[PDB]
Amino acid sequence: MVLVELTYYLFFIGYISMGAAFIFFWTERSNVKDKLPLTLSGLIVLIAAVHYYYMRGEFEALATATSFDRFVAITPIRYIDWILTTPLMVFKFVYVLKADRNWGIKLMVLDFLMVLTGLFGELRLAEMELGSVDGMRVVWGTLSGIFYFWLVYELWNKRPEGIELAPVMTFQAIEGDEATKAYVTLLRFVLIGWGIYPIGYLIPTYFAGAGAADVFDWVNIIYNIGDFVNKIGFGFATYLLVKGSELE
């Protein structure tokens, strides 16, 4: 029961924290002339807050069902959230950087295909006999990982000069202008923050049997913490960076 209660309250912390972040970002856009980036940050957490509210209510509605049933009932809503918010996050980065728009469009397409193929593998769970590993689940997840690494490759290939993997992955304070620091920040969220999701995806793929009770609530805990870190953390990291870029 304690693992169920913890999962339940993490959904609550999620929608409260997303809503508080929305209020913050939406208020702070009144103090800037270029209101688009904070508008986008606010829309991302507002969308996530609405979906977390309903995910919490659905989780509670299935407190007497299996954790597998709780997971298959809730996760499609999480993918709808991912499919709406992650293109907005990519567009916001490309916009603030003033990057090539056609390059930005390709990044958004790769992100969309990443989430969409992942969704196809999620939909295989309800058609799975447990103890078995589903072929299409592994194929869709692999293709989703390919779109993710394709996205990572494009971001890495365009990184500012001097940026190396070890300083990025070890959270070194990197020197440069706002564009360089903003690029390093995005790389860290995509390479480290976004890597939590494929790890969670591995659990319903290969560990749904294996004698373990309640692996699926652990996957919800992993995804919930990932959403909190990736949406609120990236929103506030970029807000602080743009605030410090002012030359006036």
Ligand X SMILES: *C/C=C(C)/C=C/C=C(C)/C=C/C1=C(C)CCCC1(C)C
Ligand Y SMILES: CCCCCCCC/C=C\CCCCCCCC(=O)OC[C@H](O)CO
Site string for ligand X, 79-118 (x = CB under 6 A): ---x--xx---------------------------xx--x
- Using a 10 angstrom Cβ sphere, with 0-12 exposed, 13-18 middle and 19 or more buried, the burial of residue 98 is exposed
Which residues within the stretch 140-179 sit at the binding site for ligand X (CB under 6 A)? 141, 144-145, 148
SS (HEC) of 82-149: HHHHHHHHHHHHHHHHCCCHHHHHHHHHHHHHHHHHHHHHHCCCCCCCCCCCCHHHHHHHHHHHHHHH
Which residues contribute to the site for ligand Y (CB under 6 A)? 10, 13, 83-84, 87-88, 105, 108-109, 112, 184-185, 188-189, 192-193, 199, 202-203, 207, 210-212, 215, 225, 228-229, 233, 237
| Nearest Cα to Cα of residue 218 among 62, 71, 113 | 71
| Nearest Cα to Cα of residue 72 among 151, 145, 157, 130 | 130
CB of 53 or CB of 207, closer to ligand Y: 207
Q: Is 197 in the site for ligand X (CB under 6 A)?
A: yes
CB of 43 or CB of 97, closer to ligand X: 43
CB of 116 or CB of 241, closer to ligand X: 116
- Using a 10 angstrom Cβ sphere, with 0-12 exposed, 13-18 middle and 19 or more buried, the burial of residue 116 is middle
Q: Is 52 in the site for ligand X (CB under 6 A)?
A: no
Q: Is 137 in the site for ligand X (CB under 6 A)?
A: no
Buried b (16+ CB within 10 A) or exposed e, 218-230: bbbbbbbebbbeb
Q: Among ligand Y, ligand X, none, what binds residue 201 when CB lies within 5 to 8 Å by partner kind?
A: ligand X
Considering the complex, what minimum distance in angstroms separates the CB of residue 1 from ligand X?
28
Q: Which residues bind ligand X (CB under 6 A)?
A: 82, 85-86, 114-115, 118, 141, 144-145, 148, 194, 197-198, 201, 227, 230-231
